[PDB]
Ligand binder design. Structure first.
Ligand SMILES: O=P(O)(O)OC[C@H](O)CO
Ligand SMILES: O=P(O)(O)OC[C@H](O)CO
Length: 321
């Protein structure tokens, strides 16, 4: 039985968070573990809200490809079309930004709590360009912040507004929003772990400021339940937000990396992973969007990482075990 096997693996790995497994469009596992907030004696629930972290980049990527489908941008466009003040790397294409094949990097945003337009301005003013990284896979979050700025510039909407109408409203997500406004009901607290810690003790929480949340524009500012994250990623692969032809164009790997169009592309599906602020998020999904695994945790432990567990579940699920 799948329930028995997955529960055993999650308990032996000391999982804290919510787990969802879907096979051929049917939920076969949906269970929560540990505490959303230990001091308040609030257990994690299947509908608890967790940080999606870098998995948000897959959504920013779809937003760019929606603009391509609508004739409003092209993947061959150079970044300098939208950021004319850049002094270097001006030829970098939107394609490369989506694939993490650029030389742009920004290790920190402003220490102030800024509105979106000023977060974009700060990044454009302060980003650095490494020519030796151009054209080769290297993970750099600023690419997706700058892509969120392109969404804003082309549409005349905030990224938050665009995300809300294109994902939250479109797919009737009821456990999704922006951390900066509060999670609301069924919220979770992120816990800080020691490097070698495997057992949860809830002895320290992980802080995150409004500045840090604003600076995650396009890149890791959203909370979701496991169900809402599955819904978004499956809807993308099913053609509900973007033609399947354009999903395939977007989700194309490069010569130097599986990453392309905001996800890692494999022979048997896609994967995305997030880590930050005490959280870890993991999705593996089949090419048709009908079979996959979502694990989200508010208690990240390097010595008990959840991606390896999700990878094992996914591999077995795709075989038939
Ligand atoms: P993600 O990427 O989103 O998390 C942000 C970085 O990990 C900094 O903590
Ligand atoms: O995005 P990955 O693949 O580097 O995994 C860790 C994330 O960057 C953090 O959110």
């Amino acid at each position: 039985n799948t329930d028995e096997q997955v529960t055993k693996a999650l308990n032996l790995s000391h999982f804290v968070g919510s787990a969802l497994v879907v096979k051929n469009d049917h939920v076969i596992y949906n269970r929560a573990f540990g505490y959303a907030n230990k001091a308040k004696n609030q257990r994690n629930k299947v509908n608890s809200k967790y940080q999606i972290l870098s998995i948000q980049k897959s959504m920013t990527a779809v937003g760019i490809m929606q603009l391509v489908q609508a004739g409003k941008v092209k993947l061959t466009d150079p970044i300098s079309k939208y950021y004319p003040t850049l002094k270097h790397g001006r030829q970098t294409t939107l394609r490369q930004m989506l694939d993490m094949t650029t030389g742009f990097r920004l290790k920190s945003g402003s220490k102030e709590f800024l509105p979106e337009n000023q977060v974009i301005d700060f990044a454009a003013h302060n980003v650095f360009y490494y020519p030796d990284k151009n054209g080769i896979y290297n993970y750099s979050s600023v690419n997706f912040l700058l892509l969120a700025g392109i969404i804003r510039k082309v549409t005349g909407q905030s990224y938050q507004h665009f995300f809300t109408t294109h994902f939250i409203d479109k797919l009737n997500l009821n456990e999704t929003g922006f951390l900066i406004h509060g999670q609301g009901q069924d919220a979770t607290t992120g816990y800080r772990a020691l490097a070698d810690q495997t057992l949860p003790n809830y002895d320290q929480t992980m802080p995150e400021s409004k500045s840090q949340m604003a600076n995650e524009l396009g890149t890791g500012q959203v909370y979701m339940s496991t169900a809402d994250l599955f819904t978004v990623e499956s809807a993308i692969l099913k053609g509900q937000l973007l033609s399947k032809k354009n999903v395939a164009i977007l989700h194309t790997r490069t010569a130097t990396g599986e990453y392309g169009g905001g996800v890692y592309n494999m022979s048997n599906g896609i994967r995305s992973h997030g880590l930050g602020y005490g959280y870890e998020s993991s999705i593996f999904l089949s090419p048709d969007g009908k079979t996959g695994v979502v694990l989200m945790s508010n208690y990240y432990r390097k010595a008990a990482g959840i991606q390896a567990t999700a990878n094992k579940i996914f591999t077995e699920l795709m075989k038939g075990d």
